[PDB]
Each structure stands twice: as C-alpha cells, then as structure tokens.
Ligand binder design. Sequence first.
Ligand SMILES: *[C@@H]1O[C@H](CO)[C@@H](O[C@@H]2O[C@H](CO)[C@@H](O[C@@H]3O[C@H](CO)[C@@H](O)[C@H](O)[C@@H]3O)[C@H](O)[C@H]2NC(C)=O)[C@H](O)[C@H]1NC(C)=O
Ligand SMILES: *[C@@H]1O[C@H](CO)[C@@H](O[C@@H]2O[C@H](CO)[C@@H](O[C@@H]3O[C@H](CO)[C@@H](O)[C@H](O)[C@@H]3O)[C@H](O)[C@H]2NC(C)=O)[C@H](O)[C@H]1NC(C)=O
Ligand SMILES: *[C@@H]1O[C@H](CO)[C@@H](O[C@@H]2O[C@H](CO)[C@@H](O)[C@H](O)[C@H]2NC(C)=O)[C@H](O)[C@H]1NC(C)=O
Ligand SMILES: *[C@@H]1O[C@H](CO)[C@@H](O)[C@H](O)[C@H]1NC(C)=O
Ligand SMILES: *[C@@H]1O[C@H](CO)[C@@H](O)[C@H](O)[C@H]1NC(C)=O
Lengths: 412, 416
Amino acid sequence: QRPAPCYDPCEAVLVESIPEGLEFPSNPSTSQAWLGLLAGAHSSLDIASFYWTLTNNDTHTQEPSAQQGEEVLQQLQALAPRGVKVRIAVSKPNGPLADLQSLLQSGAQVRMVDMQKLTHGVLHTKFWVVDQTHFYLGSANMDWRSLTQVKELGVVMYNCSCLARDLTKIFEAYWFLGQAGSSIPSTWPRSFDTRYNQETPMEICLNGTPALAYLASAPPPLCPSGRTPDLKALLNVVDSARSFIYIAVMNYLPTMEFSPRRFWPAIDDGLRRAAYERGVKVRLLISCWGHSDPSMRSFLLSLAALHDNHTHSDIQVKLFVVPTDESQARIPYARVNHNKYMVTERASYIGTSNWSGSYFTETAGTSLLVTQNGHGGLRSQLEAVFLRDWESPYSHDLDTSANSVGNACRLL
Amino acid sequence: QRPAPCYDPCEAVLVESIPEGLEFPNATTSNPSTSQAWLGLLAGAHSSLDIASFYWTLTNNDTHTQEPSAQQGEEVLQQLQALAPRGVKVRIAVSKPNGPLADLQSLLQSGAQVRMVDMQKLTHGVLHTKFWVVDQTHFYLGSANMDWRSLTQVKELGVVMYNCSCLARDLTKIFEAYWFLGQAGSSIPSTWPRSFDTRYNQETPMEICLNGTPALAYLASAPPPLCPSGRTPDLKALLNVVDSARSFIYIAVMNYLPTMEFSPRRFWPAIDDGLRRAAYERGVKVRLLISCWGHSDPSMRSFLLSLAALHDNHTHSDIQVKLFVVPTDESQARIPYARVNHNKYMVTERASYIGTSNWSGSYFTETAGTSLLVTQNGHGGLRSQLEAVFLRDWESPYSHDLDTSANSVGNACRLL
Ligand SMILES: *[C@@H]1O[C@H](CO)[C@@H](O[C@@H]2O[C@H](CO)[C@@H](O[C@@H]3O[C@H](CO)[C@@H](O)[C@H](O)[C@@H]3O)[C@H](O)[C@H]2NC(C)=O)[C@H](O)[C@H]1NC(C)=O
Ligand SMILES: *[C@@H]1O[C@H](CO)[C@@H](O[C@@H]2O[C@H](CO)[C@@H](O[C@@H]3O[C@H](CO)[C@@H](O)[C@H](O)[C@@H]3O)[C@H](O)[C@H]2NC(C)=O)[C@H](O)[C@H]1NC(C)=O
Ligand SMILES: *[C@@H]1O[C@H](CO)[C@@H](O[C@@H]2O[C@H](CO)[C@@H](O)[C@H](O)[C@H]2NC(C)=O)[C@H](O)[C@H]1NC(C)=O
Ligand SMILES: *[C@@H]1O[C@H](CO)[C@@H](O)[C@H](O)[C@H]1NC(C)=O
Ligand SMILES: *[C@@H]1O[C@H](CO)[C@@H](O)[C@H](O)[C@H]1NC(C)=O
C-alpha cells in the first residue's frame, strides 16, 4: 500500500551561484534564496553544513565579494533572538569557528558531528530546513566564496511541509549523532523511519502538477529501514534512463578516494551498462581546477574510449573550468564548479556529494529525486542548465591544451 | 578435511601448433607439436578414448581443399579409425552441426561411438570444449579443435598430462556429463547424480605430483547448469587466479569482450572488473594479448582501449594491450579460416590457467568449456613455461600496439 499523499502547494526553484566574471549567452542566485528564507523564517531553522567561512576574517581576506556572505551570517544572527529556534550541525573542524561561536552567543545551538570516529567520514551534507515548510538542498557550503566566486547548484522547495519533515528526520539523525556520548544504534528509533523511498516515492503537487519526490541519505549506517540509500537512488536513476544521462559533478572517481586503496566500479559499471545495453547517451561534465585529483584523468579516458560506432555506445566527457584573472587568483580556494546533479529524460537527482565511494559508504550526504510526467518542470530546467554549461566555452575535451583554458587544471 | 592425495607420476607437457611460416629466435624453448602429442597418445591408447570437440574437419575433403599441410590431420584421423577395431573404446561428443560430418561417419563405422550434444536447446550455447582422455591415465586439454588447420595453419596451445589417473578420471566426470547430455530424451537435472560430483575444486585442489614435485591442480567447468555441487565454475576459477595475483597477470586469448557476444544485449564486466581491481588495488601488471584476423569482432577494439587508458603514473596501474596477428602470404590466404592465434590461457607469478573458451559472457554462462588450474611452489615448471611462451609471443614481431597500421601487419585485422 502506498503511503499518504501530500497536499501542500510545493514549488521547486533551481538556484545557482554564478561566479563573478562568468558570462553566458536565468535562475535566482543562492544568496537571494538564502536571504529570502532567512527573512521569512518564523519558527525554526535546521542547517546541515560542512564548514563555516562566511566573513572576510574567516578566510583572512578583504574581498568585497564576501558582502553577500557577510550579510547572510548577520541575518542568521538575527534568527534566534526573534523567536526562531536555530539548530546547526557541522562536521568536526580543526579549530573553533568564529561564525559558530557568534551564532552560539546569538542564541543558536551548534553541535559538531565527529563522523571520522563513527563511520570514518565527514559531515559533507549541506541543506537547510526552514519552519518545517521550506528547504534548500544543494552544493553551496556556508561559505561566502560559495555565493560569488564558485559555481553552485541546488534546489529550493517552498511550501512543502511533508518533504520538509522528511528532511528534518535526517537532520534529527545528525543532531542525535552530535551528542558527546552518542553512537550509531543497531536499529534507529522508529521516529526516524520514513515511508517514502524509491519503491514508494512521495506524491507531491509540484508547481500545480503531480510528481513523485523523495530523499535519499548516506552513509548506510545513517539510514533507517525505510530510507533509500543514496547510492541505490543514484543507480536507479542511472538504470531507468532510456534516452540520455547528463551528469555534472566536481569529482568523479570509481575508487575509494581515501583508504588500503579499493576499487569501486558501481557508478562506472552502471554508466557502461546504460551506454551499451540501452544505447543511452551519457554526457559527463567534470569540474577541474588546481586541486583536482590527477588520477581522475585515466579513469575518465577509460569511459571516453567507449564512444564507438560498432558498439553504438555514446559516452562523452567534458571538463568545466572557471576562468580566473590576476585579482581572482588571489582569492583562496575559489573559481570552481561545485555542482552535483544528474538529469535524464524522465528523472532528476540533486545531491550534496561528489561521485566516489567514500561519499556513498562513509561520508554523510542527502539527495533529492524528482520524477514528473510533464513536458518539463524541474527536470527541463536542470537539462537546460546542463546544456548551457556543456555548450559554454568553458567546457573542453580531454585533449585540450592547458594554456587556453583560463585557469589551472591538473587534468589537462 | 582435505581429500585423499594422488600418487600417480603426473607429467605436464606444453604442446603448441605453430603455423607454417612463423619464425622465432634461437632458443625460444620449443615444445612438442600438437600433432606429435596426438599421434603418441593414439599410438599408446589401449583401453578407451574420450574426446570433447567443437567440430570435425580433419581431411582436405571436409574443407574442400587440396593442401598438403592437411597431411598431419588426415594421419590423426587414420589413427583414430584404427582405435576401435583393435579394442580401444572410442566415445565422441560433438556440438550439433547443421549437416552430417564425414569424419564422424567414418569413425562410426570404424567402431567408435559418436553422440551429438544440442547445447542450443539446453542452455542456448554450443559444445565448445576440446579435450582428450586416454585410458583414464593421460589427457590433453587445449584450444585445438578436431581440425587439420589446427595442426599446421592455426596457432594453438594446450597441455598434455601423462600418467595422472586421478585427474583423468576427474575429467572423465565432465565427459560423462557431456555423454549423458547426448542422449535423445535427456535434459539437465536439477541435481546431478552423485557419480558426477567431484571432491577436488578451488577450495580443496587435488594434490598431484607434477614432474617429481608436489602441486595443487583442479579442473573447472562451464556453464553452471553443467556443474555438479563440488565442481568449481570456470568463471570462479579464473577470477580467483586474477584476484590472487600479486605481481603480474599475463592473458593470451583469441577474443576478449566484456559483454554477451550473442544476445537483448547484456553488459558483462566480471573479468574486466577483476583486471581493473588487480591493476589498481594491488598494482598488478596486466598484459593482454588478443588475436586479430579478418573475422574479429570490431566492437572488441573500443573496450580494449578502455583498458589501455588505465595506464597512468598517478594511479600506478600498469595495463598494456597488444594484438597478435599471424602473417599470411599469397598461398596461405586461400586456406579458409586459418592463420590465427587460438590460445586461451592465463599465467601469473604463482598460478597457471589453461582453458578452451574465449573470454566473453556466453562461454561462462551458456557455452560448455573446461579449464585446468595448476599451482606449484617451485622455481620454474609449468607456470614458468607458460610465462616463457607468453613472453616469446608478446615480444615477437607479430605483436603490435593498438595504434599500429593494418598494412604493415601481414594480415587483415579489423581491430587495426
Ligand atoms: C616435465 O616432464 C615432461 C615429461 O617428462 C617434460 O616434457 C619434455 O619437455 C622437453 C622440453 O620442453 C621436451 O624436449 C623438447 O622437445 C622438442 C620436440 O618435442 C624439441 O624441439 C626441444 O628442443 C626439446 O628437446 C620433451 O620432448 C618433453 N617430453 C615429452 C615426452 O614430451 C617437461 O619439459 C618437464 N617440465 C615441465 C616444466 O613441464
Ligand atoms: C608415462 O608413463 C609411461 C608408461 O606408463 C612412460 O613410458 C614407459 O616407460 C617405461 C619405463 O618405466 C617403459 O616400460 C614400462 O614400465 C612400466 C613400469 O615402470 C610399466 O607399467 C609399463 O607397462 C611399461 O612396461 C615403457 O617402454 C615406456 N613406454 C613409452 C611409450 O615410452 C613415460 O615415460 C611416462 N611419461 C610420459 C611423459 O609419457
Ligand atoms: C515553479 O514555481 C516557482 C515559484 O513561483 C517558480 O520560480 C519563480 O520563477 C519566476 C520566473 O518564471 C521568477 O520570477 C520567480 O522569482 C521564481 N520564484 C522565486 C521564489 O524565486 C518556478 O520557475 C516554477 N517552475 C516551473 C517549471 O513552472
Ligand atoms: C508559499 O506560500 C506563501 C503563502 O501561502 C506565498 O506567499 C508564497 O508565494 C508561496 N511560495 C511561492 C514560491 O510562491
Ligand atoms: C640456441 O638453441 C640451442 C638449441 O635449442 C640451445 O642448445 C642453445 O643453448 C641456444 N643458445 C643459447 C645461447 O642458449
């Protein structure tokens, strides 16, 4: 029996951070969505974050481009004293965070999740839940560089209380794990379970149209019985595709990135199966900067060789590099595409994890999966964004020269 | 509890069919020819002979030819026709052909027993296995079909085990499976009769004495429907050899394709995933030697490139792919379906695998095949001889990289 449907007028908006200087031949910016959500917050706010560097002092900079971030943090400091219950879960850092301390003295609650001891990973998840009604899910960290100097993609769902509570369940898992003497139970309490998963997705009304949406979580130790693992959701979306698969992730690596080294061909085998068996067109867009793993190159070539007229398989790989000028090269750890999403002709997947084994086995993450039988919607907007990025002059084949790219790219 | 050890003085001999015209440097340990081994086994046969074969073209009349190079094959056929009238019990199981086979009829009236196994009806495959069992004592296992071209015009590799009764009976078990399937109203049972089961497998290999030195040897069979409870599947044995390798993996097969060749198309990354895991995790050096002629699947090329791209200094993986092509001149180009390398084997620093199947999904899921796996803690032996053969072929001027031109190869090669 399918679970109860939801009747809230949910509205999904694609949100993106376009770095300063990037020009294209438009979705709202991440800063606008965050500021609007903070202004409209009245009862509660839950945040799952990786790190907190929102001010020029955090990054030891004097960039005007930090203004948006500096505003956002200030707005966060306004939430607690006016009645909003603020709960913040962060990955355990190397040192105390000034933003978190200031929020703590503004009235917020901050807990550090020590995922390294628990599942040998980090709290890589980045999402917001507002008043149990709205939620943002994307790749934007709590970083000012994530608002003006780094390309980011996410989705903001407004007026969807049911899905917001579904995400609040995962946030509650994180919050419980944030306690000092806490460990992962063998079975989570039944208050953590969900009836909405891959087999029975939640029936929502998206922009006045029925849709099937659900949330997947990783790692498997942080998954109640009824919660679909993130890898299972990703592989289902990959396997159900019949026409095309468009993937945009910062890092794609069919191994365990940090481990004795282990091979992990799950997503790679799924993509190869889609390309060969059903003739699915696979386009893979990988971000490259001066901090990319060089070992990423060879594996990517191992996919690009599958483009062959005899096999009829069509796998193409492009590298997205954000150009940097003399001034922007001084901004530390910026000018990248941090996007993490996949779109087919029939499904949409938006995640907060890079595509490697750890992010699906040890490292926490959440992903939103949407299916809709319309002529468009969120899926069409995702496809349009991917096509714009893919056809932009910032995407290059694996044989391109490094000099004429505009930025340092280890893979080239 | 390990099973009982064997005390027969087993002796393994590498056997090869080197096509006429193929030249090698001075030493290049020359192994006995396949024709010589077959003739010796037929001359020494006294009680029984069991043969698993794909097809039977041993004379010039079968292939509509007049080549003197067929002489060897025809001689073998004659010796086969001599086995039954002098008391040797001959049983022949062959893949079901489209039309009657002259060799099989002539053997049938010479006193032999011939049964056709219809694997297409049973598991949607063919009887691809090629082995000989002589007097329940000796056995040949290799890639040489019952073809005269397999003796002089096609490169073949195999192993002949002499004076090893235990392994010969173990192979006779698989042969009994084949022979039972040759009956008219017969189908694969859910469980095979206990007379078909074997106690020697990957977990507990048979303890044999190979060239006066203890060794662990066993036989794997495919497809799984043709496998008793105690029989190790061929894919499991192959993947165990791949995963247990710590230094290098040398593979020489006519066809390598990580999909189901004839099927709705299916992807099949088992062997490919094993090779990638060996290359990346344990830094295993992988050499892949693929035969190419005018009948090779072109779709083989891209996948092979997909392996050669794993060669990277950052990953420390070492994967190399080469194509072995047998040169043909004006006269030899007229012999139909010849001038190829038919070897099917793998060798690591610690194990040897010799099979009668190409490396693709069907041969491990639907198509019958047998393979011999040998391990020995010596300095040389069968593993060293196999490695030497692979190195000689790999460094021979008949091996080329995947970007070589087809004109300067000496034969038609679709992959180039
Ligand atoms: C294990 O024992 C077997 C049997 O005793 C050995 O087989 C023998 O191997 C040698 C060397 O490969 C063969 O000599 C060679 O003969 C060919 C012609 O057949 C000739 O061209 C070479 O120059 C060389 O003289 C020998 O014929 C062969 N014996 C039989 C009966 O076939 C085997 O070498 C031993 N070792 C291993 C690692 O198997
Ligand atoms: C494999 O075994 C055969 C015989 O089983 C070996 O050849 C044979 O060697 C024996 C000498 O030991 C010669 O006489 C034989 O004596 C044994 C007892 O030792 C007996 O059981 C036999 O019936 C026979 O009388 C025999 O002439 C000789 N035969 C041949 C054809 O060479 C052979 O060397 C062993 N190894 C290989 C690689 O074949
Ligand atoms: C679904 O509804 C949302 C909410 O209205 C749409 O997002 C708005 O899009 C318009 C442009 O069409 C912008 O002017 C608004 O600013 C957006 N809203 C917000 C809060 O930023 C979204 O475009 C709709 N999607 C579809 C496919 O109809
Ligand atoms: C959500 O609901 C409120 C009040 O019902 C409305 O003002 C707002 O526009 C809705 N959200 C969107 C994105 O339209
Ligand atoms: C050349 O071959 C012969 C015969 O196989 C062998 O005796 C000789 O040792 C070989 N030459 C060298 C240098 O080993």
